[PDB]
Symmetry: C2
Subunit: 342 residues, 2 copies
């Protein structure tokens, strides 16, 4: 019955959107693909036929029920309203609409019922991938005990930066692997291909800098701040206290978060495990890892401990890993599309 | 004038001890090396001559002024008292003596003057490498504002596990690098050499598990707990609140820490930078990385921000990287030896 479009169909997220529409048997009677000029004209196979890659800027959106955007914020600022004007419900995987009070910022199993129905601009915004990984986990704990403060340190995979991050990690690793053991005694022993995407080499390194420094005197990047703004909007906690540090690691796909979460009443590790074991979009594991998360749908959560720095057992430390291309981007937009058409 | 010994001279830390004794022109008129049977007999070059590798268990310690141990805790429990009995001041890089109230646990520029002189057992304990990286930084901030709570998430290099960790990371990376991009869509796409040292693959992964689970019902590992016990003893803050999560990353050498530190009075990022820029054993940088830290002596510190989850500007978030074989192990023992013989 449904007509679906994918805007930005050739990028990594677009590819995963395509794979998931197919794998999840999304009941779309028509599927359309869009990219930008010079990518358009080409056809891409989808379930037994070849689909034209149309021009997102100039193609006619009429007829589409839902469009999944993963084409950057610039494209979204212009095209999402154009599509919505043509009657299309837009689900946007970009930062363009996230701060707009008339655009719900939705994690499918968290705040769909609460926020998704109120969309006067015809747009639903897809959350930041790093934040998204934590949301199915934190929602469950919040409902139980009321979340009041987060400390977060992330371990972010390079596919977060698109193909460019993947290529930068791969080319560096390939160039230096031959002399790798020398890095044990001298981090400058080898010749790394010059970094381009990242501020330092990423292979065999960690880089505590993701994004642009916000012009607010804070020293925080926009990615650091997304953890604050988006957790607040998604969980419906306008005054949530959040301190996040986004750190890039040499992992291809799978973002991880070391989370110290404080609640308004005591919440034990045993009780947190009991609640998360049940939970939608969550899998309880002893040691979450991004390799285990990459290619699967659920947020992996474990290493749940009391944080003694919070009085009276109101604080936990826990670790989460999640696929940043799947739940972190493509999958969530599709789950929203599923709930919209249930 | 001085007579120095190195017990465990053939391991990674022993190698760095040897390199540094040479590079730092340590005024030892005699240098002796020790390992265990089957490593002994061999000679190792040191500054213009070849030194016999003696048997740590059966050799006679008499004559040595100082012995630097990096031979594990089991060996230390027995041999450190034997050496101390023979009049040797023992500086031990192991966990054996760290919890002993009659053994100072010393970071050279932090608590040497305060604690080192009181050593009734003839032993000074070298701190955990992960904790050690943070100590020259936190001491300076503590002196200014009084440190009261830490949250810590680490990014720990594999040389922390000796040659075995280095080899496990190298062999895995070499085996899978050919098909690496497949990990973007499926973390289980490739055949990793089976892990042995770590609970999961380490190449292109992160593994939130370092050490043995403590039999105290906490869910914490012994490495997680070292951040609590050792920070308390080193900084002289018996009731310091600490929550740490130790996470292994695919880095050869260089441990990193994302630290959220709370003080008893307001401490601004600007003021923290002013204090650390001066500081002994510290280098202020925009983006600390373990590749930059590996092969150098100072703790690299930056990304200093206010943590808004702490009222009234009493909380910071900051990031530290430090070489775990140098300051984290070998260098600190040598700096203590230097201060003992100044």
């Amino acid at each position: 019955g449904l007509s679906i479009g994918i805007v930005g169909a050739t990028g990594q997220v677009g590819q995963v959107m395509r794979t998931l529409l197919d794998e999840r048997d999304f009941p779309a009677s028509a599927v359309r693909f869009f990219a930008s000029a010079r990518s358009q004209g080409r056809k891409l196979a989808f379930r037994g036929q070849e689909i034209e890659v149309e021009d997102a800027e100039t193609a006619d959106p009429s007829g589409l029920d839902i469009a999944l955007f993963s084409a950057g914020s610039a494209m979204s600022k212009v095209q999402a309203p154009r599509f919505a004007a043509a009657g299309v419900t837009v689900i946007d995987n970009s930062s363009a609409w996230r701060k707009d009070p008339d655009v719900p910022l939705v994690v499918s199993e968290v705040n769909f019922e609460r926020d998704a129905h109120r969309r006067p601009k015809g747009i639903i915004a897809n959350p930041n991938c790093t934040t998204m990984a934590a949301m199915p986990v934190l929602k469950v704990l919040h409902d139980e005990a009321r979340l009041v403060r987060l400390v977060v340190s992330s371990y972010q995979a390079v596919s977060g930066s698109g193909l460019a991050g993947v290529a930068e990690l791969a080319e560096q690793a390939r160039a230096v692997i031959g002399g790798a053991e020398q890095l044990v005694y001298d981090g400058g022993a080898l010749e790394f291909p010059p970094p381009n995407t990242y501020v330092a080499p990423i292979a065999f390194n960690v880089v505590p800098l993701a994004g642009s420094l916000v012009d607010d005197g804070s020293g925080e990047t926009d990615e650091d701040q997304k953890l604050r703004f988006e957790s607040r909007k998604i969980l419906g906690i306008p005054d949530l206290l959040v301190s996040g540090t986004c750190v890039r690691v040499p992992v291809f796909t799978g973002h991880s978060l070391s989370i110290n979460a404080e609640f308004a009443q005591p919440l034990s590790p045993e009780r947190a495990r009991e609640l998360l074991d049940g939970a939608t979009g969550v899998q309880l594991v002893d040691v979450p890892t991004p390799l285990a998360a990459a290619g699967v749908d659920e947020s992996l959560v474990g290493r749940i401990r009391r944080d003694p720095g919070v009085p009276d057992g109101r604080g936990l430390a826990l670790f989460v890993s999640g696929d940043n291309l799947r739940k972190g981007a493509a999958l969530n937009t599709i789950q929203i599309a599923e709930l919209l058409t249930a």
